[PDB]
């Protein structure tokens, strides 16, 4: 009946975005504007209305292919944020995440300790999470791309961004305590 606190959870997410904030563009596009992406994420719940969540976009290669494909060297990336949601129903709930994505790459280093370009652009998300069955949860959330860098006076209205859907697992049933 009552909610839980001081617990952890893990899952996977997959969504599509209208347009990315990339700088190197050299493609016409599959249809018009939509890029599907997959990844994994997990989080810890501190209280009924205050929790934490982290995530990172995995990668998949094709062992059966002899084509030159490179981009970075010893590079890594991860995202860390806080989750804030409200319990509308025992099974249906709403949540919002706010944090930042950390990105780092390697490019010529003489063991001196210097950087050229790091990724630290705070981001947030919004959606709802529902429980279909024990040890199995599913939720959908969206992200805003037009709301950073510089505030626009007039033009397009903020009513469309990133659309994603992922599943999450909650561990910590117990019996007494």
Q: How is this structure best described in words?
A:
This protein is an all-beta fold and 177 residues long. The chain has one domain (1-177): Beta Barrel (Porin). The protein contains no helices and eight strands. The protein has strands at residues 7-17, 35-45, 51-56, 76-86, 92-104, 119-133, 136-143, 162-171. It has an eight-stranded antiparallel beta barrel with strand order 1-2-3-4-5-6-7-8. Strand 2 (35-45) and strand 3 (51-56) form a beta hairpin. The two termini are 15 Å apart. The chain crosses the membrane at residues 7-17, 35-46, 50-58, 76-87, 92-100, 122-131, 136-144, 162-171. Residues 18-34, 59-75, 101-121, 145-161 are extracellular. Residues 2-6, 47-49, 88-91, 132-135 are periplasmic. It is found in: Cell outer membrane. Monomer. Homodimer. Interacts with Lpp. About 10% of the C-terminal periplasmic domain dimerizes when expressed without the N-terminal domain. Interacts with F plasmid-encoded TraN during conjugation.
């Amino acid at each position: 009946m009552a909610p839980k606190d001081n617990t952890w959870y893990t899952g996977a997410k997959l969504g599509f975005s209208q347009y990315h904030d990339t700088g190197f563009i050299n493609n016409n596009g599959p249809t018009h504007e939509n890029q599907l992406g997959a990844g994994a994420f997990g989080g810890y719940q501190v209280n009924p209305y205050v929790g934490f969540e982290m995530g990172y976009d995995f990668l998949g290669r094709m062992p059966y292919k002899g084509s030159v494909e490179n981009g970075a060297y010893k590079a890594q990336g991860v995202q860390l944020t806080a989750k804030l949601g409200y319990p509308i129903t025992d099974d249906l709930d709403i949540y919002t995440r706010l944090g930042g994505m950390v990105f780092r790459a390697d490019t010529k280093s003489n063991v001196y300790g210097k950087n050229h370009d790091t990724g630290v652009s705070p981001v947030f998300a919004g959606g709802v999470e529902y429980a279909i069955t024990p040890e199995i949860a599913t939720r959908l959330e969206y992200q805003f791309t037009n709301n950073i860098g510089d505030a626009h006076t007039i033009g397009t209205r903020p009513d469309n961004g990133m659309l994603s859907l992922g599943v999450s697992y909650r561990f910590g049933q117990g019996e007494a305590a």
